[model samples]
Target: GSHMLNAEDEKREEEKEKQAEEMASDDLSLIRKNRMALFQQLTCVLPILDNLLKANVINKQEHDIIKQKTQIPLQARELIDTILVKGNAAANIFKNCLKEIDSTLYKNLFVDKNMKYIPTEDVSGLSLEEQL
Candidate 1:
């Protein structure tokens, strides 16, 4: 009976390990693939936002809403919840808000640097399989 109980415990532990592995594998791979597109979408986002908002290229109202927009990552998770609920309305929201978001001037500005800017993502990270 003791030997049988030990086998049952070992099996339970193995199952627990397997379940955790499944969760990690799913999230890590999703993050691995999703991060590239997310990064690309957010490429130059902050600098452009600062130059736009701080430079007052947009409006005074924008930052007023987010001046202290909660603690990020936490706030970001909260927003993910909102977006999930908004569904297609969420996309329409971006379309509406960005309709006038002309970044052409910003691109033209980038030309002043001879089409160069701070390194976006290190090429080393691009080689995902090479991570130590």
Candidate 2:
């Protein structure tokens, strides 16, 4: 029945959620390990900055100074460094916001070869093996 299909969709969503949660647990350490790449390659720090400030993950002074960075790369460097020292919770929020804002960068940094992300039904026809 249609309801059964809905249930299966819900299950798949749950599985994705579980996997995301598991990945998130190690996000801070992963970010720390790949700090250089993030600073150099990440160009979308502004969105993450907004979320962090809205979440109170960083204070107004910190936000203002980070916003004042003359270049995007420096802004990223400052943002990452600040979150890195702010401890677990702040780092988690920053990481999640990164994932939402810069998905490709997030995948490049966090998603490794050992584990492939299973695709949802949205792209069932296309072969992802060649894409990755």
Candidate 3:
């Protein structure tokens, strides 16, 4: 019985290892294919960051301070910092591209009908307001 149990456990471990290898292989393939798409997406994301910066959602000084305070492992921290910096830069590029494509696309794209910037009048009974 003990021998049988040990054999079963060994088989389970082997199956787990096999599954893990398969998952890693799939992940590697996905990352390889999506690498360029990731870069393009990041580049297109710059305008969103710029808008957030303009809206005071984030600031460079505060971001830098947070990066300083994280105190993670050096490689992990460096990666995080790089992502933040590059993401923001990408968002700026996206914003510029949107502007070049059309002035109001960003402002008007996802806004609700009740947006303050949009021309809307107060309904006496409804008191309609834009939802965030």
Candidate 4:
């Protein structure tokens, strides 16, 4: 089901929980690892964003906007948009924002032998082929 990142998509959440219950334990464990990777990125970026406030690169409005936006589950691109566009900022975060999320979440989640995403199926269930 299609759902917005920060929006209340209880239906999507319900489907996700149902899927988790049905998924293999090993798959769920990997899924959790993927989830934790997002948290790790947030912990790292939040302080940096705050420091952006501290340094006055971004105001309290900007900081709060980034805060709320980053909290939107685990979609990397969404938060990047928040960083750039939230509160009328001029994409100042630019590549730095993408770099953090890319390195933090997307890099490990989807092996970009070059893949484009526009919100499709959740990545939790993909059976990836780990090559040497």
The candidate maximizing lDDT is 2
TM-scores for candidates 1 onward, in order? 0.27, 0.55, 0.20, 0.25
Q: Over the stretch 10-96, how does candidate 4's per-residue lDDT look in tens digits?
A: 457566223223333343343334433443334455433443454444466655665665553443433443433332232334324
Model 2 Cα lDDT, one tens digit per residue, 69-89: 557777777777667556566
Off by over 4 Å in 1: 1-38, 43-81, 103-119, 123-132
Residue-by-residue lDDT tens digits, candidate 1, 36-113: 333334433444334334333235564444446654333334333433343333434332323336455334322332
RMSD of 3: 20.8
Worst 10 residues of 2 by lDDT: 113-122
Query: Of models 3 and 4, which has the larger TM-score?
Result: 4
What local distance difference test score does each model get? 0.39, 0.64, 0.42, 0.42
Model 4 CA lDDT for position 32:
38
**lDDT digits (tens) for residues 1-132 of candidate 3:** 555533557457556332233234332443334434344233334343344445443477755554565543432333333434444433344345556654565454323212223223334555479677
In candidate 3, which residue pairs clash?
A: 45-91, 46-90, 46-91, 46-92, 47-91, 47-92, 47-95
**Sort by TM-score, top down from the best:** 2, 1, 4, 3
